[PDB]
Amino acid sequence: RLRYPPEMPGAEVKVYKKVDNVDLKLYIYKPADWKPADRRSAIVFFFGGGWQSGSPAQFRPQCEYFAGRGMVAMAADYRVGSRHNVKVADCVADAKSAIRWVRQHAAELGVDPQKIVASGGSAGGHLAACTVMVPDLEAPEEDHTISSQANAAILFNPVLILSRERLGTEPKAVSPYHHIRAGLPPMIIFHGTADNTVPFETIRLFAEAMKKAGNRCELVPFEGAAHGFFNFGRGDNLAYQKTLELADEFLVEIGFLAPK
């Protein structure tokens, strides 16, 4: 089960942000035959936990998988309410910092700065959505001429409508649904139809409005599945395996990954 601080065997650790004397880390899984001159796609995972808890260990299985497939895969730590005096808008700033850091350091990471994927589950899927479509909420001292916007997203039962005391902004400013517009990066979404934490209908409504604006927004329902269905260990790792094979296919389709 998940522990914080996480153990991340085999990952290279880099501090991507220093803020209130906290050193926030990225845990980086490089593929075989990796070289700095490479231009691989990257994927950055944001754990779930209601913006209050959670662990980067959550997406360690997925990191190992996508590293095995030739991406530079990484799990980001970010500040959360039970550990740091933060609100949702601060978590957004951290998620954006992580994407900007990867892009800023793309040359030394062997990464194509235009093939950075944001990903996460629940609150972390909300953060990944924020890095593709929610404006502003940037760390004020960072270089805003380096974009923090990811080039694609892969979302595991995200929160996408926040339409209050722990947000740190007026709710629309952290609500991906309220920033749907044309010209957005492609994404795929996995959600359980029996999710009692985040109602499936909010996600269905989100995807229909994205498609109307011309965006590639694929929603894959998991019939009768509950919140968290996708994680390593839940069930018999069937949905775990299925989301990875569908996410893999999605990355191949958009040109970020080579076919197996």
Author numbering: 5 to 167, 185 to 281
Can you quote the paper on this entry?
In order to facilitate the purification costs, we searched the ESTHER database for a thermophilic esterase, and identified the Esterase 2 from Thermogutta terrifontis (TtEst2) that has been previously structurally characterized, and presents an open active site that could ease protein engineering for further optimizations. The recombinant protein was purified, biochemically characterized, and its kinetic behavior towards different OPNA studied, before performing a structural analysis of its complexes formed when soaked in a racemic solution of the OPNA. Biophysical characterizations demonstrated that TtEst2 is a monomer in solution, with some polydispersity and good thermostability at physiological pH. We determined the bimolecular inhibition rate constants for five representative OPNA, namely tabun, sarin, cyclosarin, VX, and paraoxon, to estimate if this enzyme could scavenge them at a fast pace.
Continuing this characterization, we solved the structures of the tabun, cyclosarin, and paraoxon conjugates. For each of these structures, the mobile region 165–190 could not be reasonably modeled, despite the presence of multiple disconnected blobs in the Fo–Fc map, notably a peak of >4 σ at the location of the indole ring of Trp180 in the VX-TtEst2 structure. For paraoxon, the strong electron density peak at covalent distance of Ser126 was modeled as an ethylphosphoryl adduct. This is consistent with the loss of the ethyl group close to the His248 through the dealkylation “aging” mechanism of cholinesterases. As in all the previous structures, the additional peak of electron density in the vicinity of the three different adducts was modeled as small molecules, a phosphate with partial occupancy (0.7 and 0.75) for tabun-TtEst2 and cyclosarin-TtEst2, and a carbonate for paraoxon-TtEst2, depending on the respective shape (trigonal or tetrahedral) in the feature-enhanced maps. However, the active site of TtEst2 being largely open to the solvent, there are no residues that could stabilize the leaving groups of paraoxon and VX, which are in consequence freely moving in the solvent.
